[model samples]
Target chain A: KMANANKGAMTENADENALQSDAKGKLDSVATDYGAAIDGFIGDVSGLANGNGATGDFAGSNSQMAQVGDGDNSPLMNNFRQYLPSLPQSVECRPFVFGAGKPYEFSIDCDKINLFRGVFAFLLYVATFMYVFSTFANILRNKES
Target chain B: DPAKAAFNSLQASATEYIGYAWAMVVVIVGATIGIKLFKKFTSKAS
Candidate 1:
């Protein structure tokens, strides 16, 4: 039977109607199952980010929250912030805040990111020439026929 | 010709670097391969 464009999509024949309903039933059930499976995923992520203290409220005092904007509190953050200033004065990167709970931020420049792909290949290409030259130099020295 | 000269310069710089790099690669690889082949054949001629 031809499909009908009904709002709920009732097929022209009962046979097709049952089939569509069955497919939709399975799809909805699968969607719900997946939804329930991942229901606590965000909460679990927040718990991990919160670091030992889990609270429902955003304002809840936690180690990560306490460390916010306090570079010295986290040794890694302190060192990383210190190192960023050592980069060339000409170089600049866009800063990104990855999370709300932990709120870890890092700097990235889009042009630099894409440019690095070319740069890496360029470096490899230069090394390849070095290898070829090294082999050719050895060949140059060997006089035996 | 515009106020965004810095960005334009950056683009030009990147483009120039790539173009020069390509020429450099071609020149080095092309000449070295020729020399290597010529020298190898010269040794074989003996």
Candidate 2:
């Protein structure tokens, strides 16, 4: 009986070890896949944000506009130009560029982003549950025989 | 009897877990292939 129990325990341990290793390998591959996918997504977003010329030659022109308006008659205009150098051009221009001429409009369909995040969260949760379940099974099996 | 029951439970759980994992793998592979196909065909539109 003792020898049989030991053998059984050994077999259980081996099976559990294999399961754990397989689960770990799968989790690693999923994580790697997610990492690559996220990297690609970030690259796409970065390209859209930076390369789209949304602001459009404001930095150089603003200062020049300030200098040109130095001797202007209107104080409000001069004050406006003063603020123009420090003006939030990017904030103002973002709507025109991204909204495609829709003024003061911020529309984002968060469904896609939410879906991606939900899947990522669920994948991680499932991976963690598998790890824990395997560990629990391994312990229980080891203790039995 | 207890030992047998434990073994049975373990076997069931392992089988179920493996089945679910395999299903997940299949779905992931299918989605990956679909995305690759879409990317290949839709890339020319850009």
Candidate 3:
């Protein structure tokens, strides 16, 4: 059976402010799950670029690659926000807020968010490289006498 | 014309890679910040 996880997405039904209001309360609710999933998937990969041994791919179980999804406590966001001033304001990103409780508001440029993705991508690339590195390291380190 | 074609070719190289790249870097940098987060979240085993 196929299950549908509808996010109650509607643009017209929700008046400008109502859509704002409905989504307002749902900022970090299940609403942002889509975005959060992106975070989680990236994090999963961040921890594992090794694929898997069964598949004989780069994915691995012992791998916890590394990633930051720009959560409230996410270190990447805090540091990334630093360069906001240095860079231009206009940018593009799939930005969304994840508020736990209480009303919250935030204002940031698209470029800023894009930068976050940019920075994380590089690290992940190097990590994939490292995974390759460790894979070889194991080969050399292992020898069945 | 070749230059224009070449430019598009470069542009054709989807920015998608960078998008994913940045996301990964965020995790790396974010994980780097709170070192404890690294050991805690990451495991040598499943």
Candidate 4:
């Protein structure tokens, strides 16, 4: 196309101009899309490090990572899906007086495990009730017979 | 001869349907397994 810059429209004016613009445009989009996809992937990995579900958008088809709401139902159907990233909330940490102005080289908190207590106890009560119900039913059955 | 010709038509459509159906099956099953791993790796640090 540039060959015809001073000479005016060349022999293949339509073909060259369109090809030049279309190819360049497509190549540019691919470059941008690839970069965006990689950025999204890095974002998601960090988001997971922060917390679960902290990642942005969704996966599979029709995801925001795919053109960010272009109605892309086949998000993973494209090359950029796996390369997409997640977003994380910003947080900071600070030192506080623990153990009464004492600090340990290492500290581990297990408070999140409290769910086990409730879950196990609930299961135990369920079993106990089930066993009692069976006994009661057996007694009634014997008398009825 | 006519029966064989009619039956040949059935094979062409049957193959296309089965081929597409199996491909879809693989996709669905693969998605399930991939999601499981995704959850494992993406879960918050314990």
**Index of the highest-lDDT prediction:** 1
Candidate 3 or 4, higher DockQ? 3
Candidate 4 residues A47-105, lDDT tens each?
54433323445333223334333343543466676676753432332222222332422
- Backbone clash pairs for candidate 2 read none
Q: How many Å off is the CA of B40 in candidate 3? A: 8.5
- What is the lDDT for A95 in model 2? 12
True interface contacts reproduced, per candidate: 0.06, 0.00, 0.00, 0.00
Report the lDDT tens digits of candidate 4 across residue range B1-46.
Answer: 9999889989976776676567656755964765455444423211
Model 1 chain A scores worst on lDDT over the 10 consecutive residues at A97-106
User: Residue B9's C-alpha lDDT in candidate 1?
Assistant: 86
Report residue A116 deviation for candidate 1 (angstroms). 36
- Which of 1 and 3 is the better model by lDDT? 1
Q: Against the true structure, what is each candidate's TM-score?
A: 0.21, 0.24, 0.23, 0.23
Ordered by TM-score, highest first, the candidates read 2, 3, 4, 1
Of 2 and 3, the candidate ahead on DockQ is 3
Docking class of 4: incorrect
lDDT of 2 by residue, B1-46 (tens): 8999999999986776676567656766965875565444333322
